[PDB]
Chains A and B, each alone.
With several copies, the nearest count.
Chain A
């Protein structure tokens, strides 16, 4: 079967540029992880746009963490200077992002598509 795209985010959510009061950025392998250390006590939902092949996440386009008001508080994006990444790189990065949000007492949920294709 041909690859198919999962698009949790709307065009607006995907293109929006967001602000971090206490910027945190980490390059992990072929991925970049960003999070605002100032964000606490919120219900956060991770949404992502990515391709899938054989019922498994293949390539991540963009993953962002949203509060209930729709504000972006963290994200995982591929680094240009890299030829690619694997679901394994994605999982490593998601763990770091979720860990920081949990540490700051945010309740973190993951989109059903991410739960299904990344697990």
Chain B
């Protein structure tokens, strides 16, 4: 690999324009639909109202 290590999760704050860490952020500042964090609502409530939710809907 060309990188010493790699980021694994897209920054949700950056997605909404709420990140001010720029390149110093620990999360990815690129939209990669396959590296989005887990949906808090789907995890805690077992359901999510957004038909287009981009966050991971994990199950048992």
Contacts and interface: CB of A to CB of B under 8 A. Distances in A.
| A and B touch in their complex, CB below 8 angstroms | yes
B16 interface: yes
A74 B2 CA distance: 37
Contact of B52 (A22, A71, A96): A22
Given A99-B40, A100-B40, A103-B40, A19 B45 contact: no
Nearest to A34: B45
Interface residues of B, number: 17
A26 B44 contact: yes
Given A37-B49, A38-B49, A19 B16 contact: yes
A29 to B, nearest CB: 14
A37 B15 CA distance: 15
A11 interface: no
Interface in A54-84: 69-72
B45 A26 contact: yes
Interface string A75-119: 000000000000000000000100110010100000000000000
Interface string A18-49: 11011111100000000001100000000000
29 contacts: A18-B17, A19-B31, A21-B15, A21-B16, A21-B50, A21-B52, A22-B49, A22-B51, A22-B52, A24-B45, A24-B47, A24-B49, A26-B45, A37-B41, A37-B49, A38-B49, A69-B17, A70-B17, A71-B16, A71-B17, A71-B18, A72-B17, A96-B44, A99-B40, A99-B44, A100-B40, A100-B44, A103-B40, A105-B16
Interface of A: 18-19, 21-26, 37-38, 69-72, 96, 99-100, 103, 105
